[PDB]
């Protein structure tokens, strides 16, 4: 969507599973919100 709208911040995979636990287990643990 950010290709169509400059007003969308892109979030990459590692920006979403960013927690130290998530990295340690290699899964999502926390809900993440993106726009
Ligand atoms: N071959 C292939 N692998 C994919 C595809 N989409 C995601 N993956 C791979 O599958 C693995 C899991 O993706 P991920 O997005 O982290 O899964 P999840 O459903 O978010 N995780 P969890 O249930 O822990 O939240 C990753 O290694 C990713 O590269 C796809 O289209 N093709």
Curated annotation (Swiss-Prot):
<comment type="function">
    <text>GTP hydrolase that promotes the GTP-dependent binding of aminoacyl-tRNA to the A-site of ribosomes during protein biosynthesis.</text>
</comment>
<comment type="similarity">
    <text>Belongs to the TRAFAC class translation factor GTPase superfamily. Classic translation factor GTPase family. EF-Tu/EF-1A subfamily.</text>
</comment>
<comment type="function">
    <text>Protects glycyl-tRNA(Gly) from hydrolysis by E.coli D-aminoacyl-tRNA deacylase (dtd).</text>
</comment>
<comment type="subunit">
    <text>Monomer.</text>
</comment>
<protein>
    <recommendedName>
        <fullName>Elongation factor Tu-B</fullName>
    </recommendedName>
</protein>
<feature type="region of interest" description="G2">
    <location>
        <begin position="26"/>
        <end position="30"/>
    </location>
</feature>
């Amino acid at each position: 969507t950010a290709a169509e709208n400059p007003n969308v911040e892109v979030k990459d995979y590692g920006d979403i599973d960013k927690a130290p636990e998530e990295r340690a287990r290699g899964i999502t643990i926390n809900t993440a919100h993106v726009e």
